[PDB]
Amino acid sequence: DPKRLYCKNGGFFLRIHPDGRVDGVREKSDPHIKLQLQAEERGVVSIKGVCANRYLAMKEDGRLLASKCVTDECFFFERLESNNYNTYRSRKYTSWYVALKRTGQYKLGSKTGPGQKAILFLPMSA
C-alpha cells in the first residue's frame, strides 16, 4: 500500500519531487504523489516518495524538503484525528506539523498548530 495523502486545506495531494522539492498538486494521477509510509516505532513513520526515492524532511527553519539520505529530520508521529484524517508531527521539532497552504505550497512547520485545517491529511490508496 503506497498511498496518497490528500490535504483537507484546499484539496492538494502531497508531492515529493526528485530534485528535493515538496509541494501539493490537485492532479491525482501525478506519479510523484505516490508515497510509502514506513513505521519505525509504534506511531512513528517516515514518508518516502516512491518515484523520487527521497524522504520527507522538516528542516530547522520550518520548511519541508525531500532528502535522499534519512536523517533524524525524516521521522514523524502519526496521529489519528476525527473522521479518519491523520496528522504528522516532527519527532525532532516536536510542536511542528507537516502541512500545506490552500495554494498547494507547504506551510512552514513553525506556523502550524493542532487545530488547523492545514495539518489534516486523508490517506488514500494509490
Swiss-Prot record:
Primary site of residence: secreted
Cellular compartments annotated: Secreted; Nucleus
Chain positions covered by the region annotation Heparin-binding: 101-117
Modified residues (Phosphotyrosine): 55
Record site: Important for interaction with integrin: 101-102, 107
Record location of the Glycyl lysine isopeptide (Lys-Gly) (interchain with G-Cter in SUMO1) cross-link: 68
One MF annotation (Gene Ontology) recorded for this entry: integrin binding
PTM summary: Phosphorylation at Tyr-55 regulates FGF2 unconventional secretion. Several N-termini starting at positions 94, 125, 126, 132, 143 and 162 have been identified by direct sequencing.
Swiss-Prot/TrEMBL keywords: Angiogenesis, Developmental protein, Differentiation, Growth factor, Heparin-binding, Isopeptide bond, Methylation, Mitogen, Nucleus, Phosphoprotein, Secreted, Ubl conjugation
A GO-annotated cellular component: extracellular space
GO term, biological process aspect, one: behavioral response to ethanol
Binding-site list for heparin: 9
Coiled coil spans: none
Tissue-by-tissue expression: Expressed in granulosa and cumulus cells. Expressed in hepatocellular carcinoma cells, but not in non-cancerous liver tissue.
Highest taxon, organism lineage: Eukaryota
Residue numbers covered by motif Cell attachment site: 19-21, 61-63
Task performed by this protein: Acts as a ligand for FGFR1, FGFR2, FGFR3 and FGFR4. Also acts as an integrin ligand which is required for FGF2 signaling. Binds to integrin ITGAV:ITGB3. Plays an important role in the regulation of cell survival, cell division, cell differentiation and cell migration. Functions as a potent mitogen in vitro. Can induce angiogenesis. Mediates phosphorylation of ERK1/2 and thereby promotes retinal lens fiber differentiation.
Extra remark beyond the main annotation: This protein binds heparin more strongly than does aFGF.
Subunit relationships: Monomer. Homodimer. Interacts with FGFR1, FGFR2, FGFR3 and FGFR4. Affinity between fibroblast growth factors (FGFs) and their receptors is increased by heparan sulfate glycosaminoglycans that function as coreceptors. Interacts with CSPG4, FGFBP1 and TEC. Found in a complex with FGFBP1, FGF1 and FGF2. Interacts with FGFBP3. Interacts with integrin ITGAV:ITGB3; the interaction is required for FGF2 signaling. Interacts with SNORC (via the extracellular domain). Interacts with glypican GPC3.
Similarity comment: family membership: Belongs to the heparin-binding growth factors family.
Designated name of the protein: Fibroblast growth factor 2
Organism of origin: Homo sapiens
Chain's gene name: FGF2
Shown residues in whole-protein numbering: 161 to 286 of 288
